[PDB]
Amino acid sequence: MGPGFDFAQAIMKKNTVIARTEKGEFTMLGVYDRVAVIPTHASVGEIIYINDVETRVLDACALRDLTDTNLEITIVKLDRNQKFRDIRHFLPRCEDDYNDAVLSVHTSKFPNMYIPVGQVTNYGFLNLGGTPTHRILMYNFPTRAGQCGGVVTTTGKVIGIHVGGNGAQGFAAMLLHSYFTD
């Protein structure tokens, strides 16, 4: 409807797939080559469904910071016959706060969903479902199950993926450029 939603749609329509694990359907962001991200709590195994196609997982890493604290991002390399548009140049280099963010989700259940979540806070530490978690972004929107893996964008930047919420607020794990140095 405006430039915020224009940037979000541009990411969703080229750089997401529907990922299915035994824990459910997730919005999965593709970053470059056959490399994609998903919340760690999706529990990625050796085989994953990608747009309902059985797909071997070539590698997967649940990321932690150098303090050995959970980041709640799993980076997946997919045995797929097609590369993602390379969007690594939209990723921020540093931890930050933002204005005017959009949370965008695409599953069988929530296709073509865009939420204007507003101001994004560099919240930092959160006890997320009993897991100490670092580099958490917070927005004041009442997010619901089905939105995990949702992409958080400003105009010009892909800043994070939705990983949880408490009924009043939503929580995203930061994406940083340094996660995807080739």
Amino acid at residue number 136: I
> In whole angstroms, how close is the CB of 147 to ligand U3C at the nearest point?
14
Which CB, 35 or 148, lies closer to ligand U3C?
148
Q: Report the b/e string of 95-104 with b at 16+ CB within 10 A.
A: eeebeebbbb
Residue of closest CB approach to ligand U3C: 129
> In whole angstroms, how close is the CB of 164 to ligand U3C at the nearest point?
6
Sign of the CA dihedral running 2, 36, 131, 176: negative
Residue 167 φ/ψ region, left for φ over 0, alpha for ψ in the -120 to 50 degree band, beta for the rest? left
Q: Is 128 in the site for ligand U3C (CB under 6 A)?
A: yes
Q: Is 172 in the site for ligand U3C (CB under 6 A)?
A: no
> In whole angstroms, how close is the CB of 177 to ligand U3C at the nearest point?
24
Helix (H, G, I), strand (E, B) or coil at 180: coil
Q: Which stretch binds ligand U3C (CB under 6 A): 12-20, 93-101, 113-121, 122-130?
A: 122-130
CA atoms within a 13 Å half-sphere pointing along the CA-CB vector of 88: 13
Enumerate the active-site residues. Answer: 41, 72, 148
Give the footprint of ligand U3C on this chain (CB under 6 A): 41, 72, 128-131, 164
